[PDB]
Amino acid sequence: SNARFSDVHGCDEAKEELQELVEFLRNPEKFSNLGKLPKGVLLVGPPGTGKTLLARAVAGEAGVPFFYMSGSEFDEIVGVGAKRVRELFNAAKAKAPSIVFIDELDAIGGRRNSRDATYVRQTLNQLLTEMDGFAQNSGVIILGATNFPESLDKALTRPGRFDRHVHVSLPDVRGRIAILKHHAKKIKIGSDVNIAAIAARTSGLSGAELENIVNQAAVHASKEKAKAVMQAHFEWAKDKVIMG
Ligand SMILES: Nc1ncnc2c1ncn2[C@@H]1O[C@H](COP(=O)(O)OP(=O)(O)O)[C@@H](O)[C@H]1O
């Protein structure tokens, strides 16, 4: 089963804004008849805040294919980037409406070395060509995730490309409660568990780390042959995730 919005907690504003992307992908013709359409949307936030989960959730809510691409695939220098970019969008266009998710978009079009210049330029221009090539109601939504929006190439954020953004920040104490409670639905919660106390002791943690706390507490409780996941198991898992 694909992701849904009910899997995303601690950033209600982001999913509310992205619901518009779901409504477009469900019916691009009906969406356009009211009169501006989105092509590229930037997801901005630290690692583990659920940018990939949101992108997958938008495809799941809309019922459209999801295509993944990582900007990190060009970290070493290795292969032809433009061929990778061209083939990905061809598969997405053939399955439109669809979602293309570009993780670590800051990597594409980076400065890098003068030796890297010919490699970086061809990959960047290929992405720019595919985005500019979407006609009318092409059906393809491009979601780009980055932790460093100031590091993006200026060509990427020009009008008609990645000209809309959605912040996916670290959850506050209320969001951490919602995240902890959501993943705690899958565990047998003990009688002394205080999720609010745990959320108050996890300021700065991402949703991924919070999910890790719930899962590590359940495993630790199972190893001790306990009948339920107790507060001591959450405290142990919290310290393990925080110390890294
Ligand atoms: N906001 C969130 N709400 C619920 N779970 C989350 C959230 N953010 C992250 N997670 C959990 O952490 C996992 C990894 O998150 P991910 O989408 O890869 O984050 P990102 O792409 O921002 O680094 C998700 O599959 C999910 O289980």
Side-chain angles (χ1 to χ4, degrees), residues 8 11 43 46-55 168 206-208:
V8 187
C11 53
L43 302 181
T49 58
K51 294 179 298 307
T52 311
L53 178 66
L54 274 173
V168 186
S206 64

Coordinates of all heavy atoms in Angstrom, one line a residue, residues 8 11 43 46-55 168 206-208:
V8 N 1.2 11.3 7.7 CA 2.0 12.5 7.9 C 1.4 13.3 9.1 O 0.3 13.7 9.0 CB 2.1 13.3 6.6 CG1 3.1 14.5 6.8 CG2 2.5 12.4 5.4
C11 N 3.0 18.4 10.7 CA 3.1 19.5 9.7 C 1.8 19.6 8.9 O 1.8 19.3 7.7 CB 4.3 19.2 8.7 SG 4.3 17.6 7.9
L43 N 10.2 21.2 -1.8 CA 10.0 20.8 -0.4 C 11.3 21.2 0.4 O 12.3 20.6 0.1 CB 9.7 19.3 -0.2 CG 8.4 18.9 -1.0 CD1 8.2 17.4 -0.8 CD2 7.2 19.7 -0.6
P46 N 14.9 20.1 7.0 CA 16.0 19.3 7.4 C 15.7 17.8 7.1 O 14.6 17.5 6.8 CB 16.1 19.6 8.9 CG 15.3 20.8 9.1 CD 14.2 20.8 8.1
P47 N 16.7 17.0 7.2 CA 16.5 15.5 6.9 C 15.5 14.9 7.9 O 15.5 15.3 9.1 CB 17.9 14.9 7.1 CG 18.8 16.0 6.8 CD 18.1 17.2 7.4
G48 N 14.7 14.0 7.5 CA 13.8 13.2 8.3 C 12.5 13.9 8.7 O 11.8 13.4 9.5
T49 N 12.2 15.1 8.1 CA 11.0 15.8 8.4 C 9.8 15.2 7.6 O 8.7 15.7 7.8 CB 11.1 17.3 8.2 OG1 11.5 17.5 6.8 CG2 12.2 17.8 9.1
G50 N 10.0 14.3 6.7 CA 8.9 13.7 5.9 C 8.7 14.3 4.5 O 7.6 14.2 4.0
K51 N 9.8 14.8 3.9 CA 9.6 15.3 2.6 C 9.4 14.2 1.6 O 8.5 14.3 0.7 CB 10.8 16.1 2.2 CG 11.0 17.4 3.0 CD 12.3 18.2 2.6 CE 13.5 17.3 2.9 NZ 13.6 16.8 4.2
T52 N 10.1 13.1 1.7 CA 9.9 12.0 0.8 C 8.6 11.3 1.1 O 7.9 10.9 0.2 CB 11.0 10.9 1.0 OG1 12.3 11.6 0.9 CG2 11.0 9.9 -0.1
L53 N 8.2 11.2 2.4 CA 6.9 10.7 2.7 C 5.7 11.5 2.2 O 4.8 10.9 1.6 CB 6.8 10.6 4.3 CG 5.4 10.0 4.8 CD1 5.2 8.6 4.4 CD2 5.3 10.2 6.3
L54 N 5.9 12.8 2.2 CA 4.8 13.7 1.7 C 4.7 13.5 0.2 O 3.6 13.3 -0.4 CB 5.2 15.2 2.0 CG 4.7 15.7 3.3 CD1 5.2 17.1 3.6 CD2 3.1 15.7 3.4
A55 N 5.8 13.5 -0.5 CA 5.8 13.3 -2.0 C 5.2 11.9 -2.3 O 4.3 11.9 -3.2 CB 7.2 13.3 -2.5
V168 N 8.8 22.2 5.2 CA 8.5 21.0 6.0 C 9.5 21.0 7.2 O 10.6 20.4 7.1 CB 8.6 19.7 5.2 CG1 8.2 18.5 6.0 CG2 7.7 19.8 3.9
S206 N 13.5 14.8 14.4 CA 12.7 14.7 13.2 C 11.6 13.6 13.4 O 11.7 12.8 14.4 CB 13.6 14.4 12.0 OG 14.2 13.1 12.1
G207 N 10.7 13.6 12.5 CA 9.7 12.5 12.5 C 10.2 11.1 12.4 O 9.7 10.2 12.9
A208 N 11.3 11.0 11.6 CA 12.0 9.7 11.5 C 12.6 9.3 12.8 O 12.4 8.1 13.2 CB 13.0 9.8 10.4

